[PDB]
Ligand binder design. Structure first.
Ligand SMILES: N[C@@H](CC(=O)O)C(=O)O
Ligand SMILES: N[C@@H](CC(=O)O)C(=O)O
Ligand SMILES: N[C@@H](CC(=O)O)C(=O)O
Ligand SMILES: [Hg+2]
Ligand SMILES: [Hg+2]
Ligand SMILES: [Hg+2]
Ligand code: NA
Ligand code: NA
Ligand code: NA
Ligand code: NA
Ligand code: NA
Ligand code: NA
Lengths: 411, 411, 411
């Protein structure tokens, strides 16, 4: 093989290179040829990711839950925790607002096979609620059907914690192992993501290659018009959420960012919120942060509190929805906010991360990728993920420090 | 929230309070209003429990099996073990007899939606037997289908034990962990039960509230006429099984019970056979019981040997069956005995315990709760569970001591 | 029970005894009586094995994969590993050639219920490839569907290894447990096989008993005509593969076998490649083998590198195929080679081993045992497994030593 380059550029090459190879084929040799020999690889890629969606949505939440089991965290955390949720809860709320002013997709409308998309009527409100509670975890889990799963995972995780406080040692010990195994399953699923991401370059080249053969050039407008909605959203996040809640705690924002200057750029280029933990802690002290404080929060916000992603999944949803020609009904629209948070708490904080947990938010809100259109749209954002992933990852780290700094203030 | 009362009364309040709120609505505002705003909560409750039914029927038996893996128990146990089964095997056999004289349900007959219940013809005997052996554990397990599951769990558990005797240490160690993880899954599922039971008060209030709006008052007769069948069954258990097998071993029954006086009342009020282990052992010595003897049996009979429940599940089945208008065919009727034992060996020995493992015995014997009628009946017993649960739990503990005392005699 | 004999003979008795009881009923009392009271037991047996097929195809490969995770093995192994695959890869390639000259089954053609067998058209090549990648591991696994499973297992296993090299200790530790649990699941599934094999005597008696009542005596020709294809294949394996690659490394083959004389006969009679490890190592030195060399290879080739089985599963497939009247299309025919290897790397190296992993190779290549014909054919080979199993097991061990000896030469 030999293929050793820095995946980041190593992927941007497929993106920029795929777009051109796609367009030239815009005219000339009809893309049909592309939809036959090129797209197949773009699909292999798309599936390798949906593969993971279940095992991670599960293992990922049983662990996430246990890392917030009230009570199971000093009240030094209770504070920080309430922090992460509200930051992320708002992060998405903001994303929807960007989706509003910016109508990414709207106009990009596609009917794939010639037929358009239409969702199945939601069962009576009563059943929609009772359905969140799986009737058979194994089953619900066995065959897609997210929510039910999420629900069971949180209940499993939070339950495991209380076993750890069990007077009995066998019990206290069993829980430790089981919880240990789950985790690992999830932690192992990431190795797979990282691995898959090594194929990202080829896959991305196929996806965008295809989206260019078809859809003409109009997609470039929508794709970029999407990115705009994201960043103008990410920077708003920081400016309207961070600085606003930093001057609220007598913290100099300006100088603040000058210290996180290394923690941000690091995460922004590596895209590995997790792999950028050391650089996030070095900066922890540098700005006079108490040891027992960033030693606890920075490592927790590395997986949880990915408000940078929550904004992503918020806008991503409206992109798909608008591209298909469907209008999200407030209710499912507020389901995104509720979901995106758990979906973000699910993200691994690695290259693939974000995108993968998007399916979680799509299956919920009725937009199965098993559908020609949805899968056709999803394949677009998944192609420009890298771009959105960078600015994404950066906010994730920021939110952490910005939380750690504020928690110190009142501790 | 604030809600801190002693669940036991805290639930009896919903029961007694729900019945009245139900009847007043007997006349006046037709219960239809109830079947619309009240029943939904009674259902949330009913599902939270069926949820657990699979993970526990599995983890619960893999562990139960390993705790009886012949050989894997001193022959000091072999004795005690043969004891528990036969006590429980008969406990149910007795329950069926109570179901006989007392026809709980019979006359309570309901057709829910207006249609009546009718079971699917059982496949040729040949297939019924071969079917107990799952063709794909994961599958069989994934989507309901008990028996197959039970079967695989026992085989898994008993198998794990033999790995622990493996000369090789890696093998011997692996088995230890895996077995450790399973357990925990089950031990964790109980935390959930306990949790769910914290909702019991609300749920019960809904269930019985509904059963009173409909069915008029005739249900009170059947419900109580059921309780009778149980207790007059539990006391018979003790009197015809315990005292009979106590005077058979030169053990003074009268005085006997005077010592277990604290172990019984304890379990009878806490309803936590497990949580009542310390009080069961304090009494262990008090009556001159050898250390190495109650140190081994009392802790084993805390989970296994729940002959108090086996009687429950025995009568419970005939209640449902009679309420629907179906006559249990001897064969499925003897299936209950065979099932109820494993179902009791599955019970956790906690508040929820009993009822939850009932579904296990229902899915077997063809009475899926996924059915309007069955689910309608089940919802009745599940409403008066607390009452039956107390006298239940008490016999569970008794059987333990009554076994420990006899095993000492011959050891 | 009492039943304590040496399963090996203890089974040959059922085989030889079943055949006679079958034929006498050839004439006289039509076998219909047999297909009603005899076959049912032959089926119980057949299912007990298919039961295991999934849990083992999974746990079995996650472990197998981790035991070859490149890199995760000294380069002292890389050598030995490349060895096992190529030996087994060719072992099967050879089996197909035996299936060619010998047309086991061809002529044995059956239509069970009166209808013949016909496979479902394979989806477009594109989908056949993308389908190997499961969309939902849990699902794919939950309900049969091998390949997808295999694929995920290898990716899980190989992934776990890289977690063990993780700087972080928690990560490094989690992977250890999870990997530990999986293994055990598989190691436990064998206990079940061994157990099931204790029923082998009865089961085999039923199977062949039936195949004799029907099919007349013509089956004896095919059954034996099959065995021939195997052995004349196993001996060719050794002579054309081993001796050829032994004189290639200045190793005296003749004398060679005189030392493995005990390691072979041992494995040949016990049929437990694994249980014959000690006798394989005693011989390790005896022939001047470096400690650090057979201490690493012999224990690895005990589970992996079962080229004796790979030849089995190679011919076994053509037996079934020919018996049904279907011609394996080169492509699925080369799928067998690719599958048989993983299928052999799946075998446990115990009595049942081989046969059980055959289903793995059948589900792949479209020949579900859920089909009257396939299941009818499979039931024949499964009846004479013991015979093929012995000569099988022997080559498995041989390949090990023959690999160890050659790796020492160049190390
Ligand atoms: N990979 C990003 C998260 C995401 O893309 O969703 C990170 O490093 O945190
Ligand atoms: N909860 C009871 C058992 C049951 O209700 O089935 C106990 O403590 O043993
Ligand atoms: N049981 C054989 C393998 C097989 O039958 O496939 C062994 O000992 O290696
Ligand atoms: Hg996906
Ligand atoms: Hg239930
Ligand atoms: Hg099989
Ligand atoms: Na996350
Ligand atoms: Na974060
Ligand atoms: Na139990
Ligand atoms: Na008990
Ligand atoms: Na193998
Ligand atoms: Na071998």
């Amino acid at each position: 093989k030999y293929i050793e380059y820095p995946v980041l550029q190593k992927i941007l090459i497929g993106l920029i290179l795929g777009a051109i190879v796609g367009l030239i084929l815009g005219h000339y040799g009809y893309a049909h040829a592309v939809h036959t020999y090129v797209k197949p690889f773009g699909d292999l890629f798309v599936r390798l990711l949906c593969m993971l969606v279940m095992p991670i949505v599960f293992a990922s939440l049983v662990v996430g839950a246990a890392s917030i089991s009230p009570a199971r965290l000093g009240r030094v955390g209770v504070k920080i925790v309430v922090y992460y949720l509200l930051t992320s809860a708002f992060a998405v709320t903001l994303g929807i607002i960007m989706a509003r002013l910016f109508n990414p997709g709207a106009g990009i409308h596609l009917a794939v096979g010639g037929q358009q998309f239409q969702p199945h009527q939601a069962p009576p409100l009563v059943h929609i609620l009772l359905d969140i509670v799986p009737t058979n975890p194994f089953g619900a889990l066995a065959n897609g059907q997210v929510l039910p799963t999420i629900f069971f995972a949180i209940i499993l995780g939070i339950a495991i914690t209380y076993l750890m406080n069990s007077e009995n040692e066998k019990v206290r010990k069993s829980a430790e192992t089981l919880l240990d195994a789950i985790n690992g399953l999830a932690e192992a699923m990431y190795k797979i993501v990282n691995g898959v991401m090594q194929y990202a370059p080829i896959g991305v080249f196929a996806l965008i290659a295809y989206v260019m053969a078809e859809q003409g050039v109009h997609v470039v407008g929508e794709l970029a018009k999407v990115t705009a909605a994201v960043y103008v959203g990410l920077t708003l996040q920081i400016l309207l959420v961070y600085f606003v809640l930093l001057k609220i705690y007598g913290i100099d924002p300006i100088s603040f960012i000058k210290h996180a200057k290394d923690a941000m750029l690091t995460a922004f280029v590596t895209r590995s919120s997790s792999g950028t933990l050391p650089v996030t802690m070095r900066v922890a002290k540098e700005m006079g942060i108490s040891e027992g404080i960033y030693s606890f929060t920075l490592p927790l916000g590395a997986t949880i509190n990915m408000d940078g992603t929550a904004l992503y999944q918020g806008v991503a949803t409206f992109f798909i929805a608008n591209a298909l020609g469907s209008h999200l009904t407030v209710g499912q629209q507020l389901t995104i906010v509720l979901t995106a948070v758990l979906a973000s708490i699910g993200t691994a904080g690695v290259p693939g991360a974000g995108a993968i947990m998007l399916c979680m938010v799509l299956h919920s809100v009725g937009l199965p990728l098993t559908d020609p259109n949805v899968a056709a749209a999803y394949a677009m954002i998944l192609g420009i993920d890298a771009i959105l992933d960078m600015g994404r990852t950066m906010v994730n780290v920021t939110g952490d420090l910005t939380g750690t700094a504020i928690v110190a203030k009142t501790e």
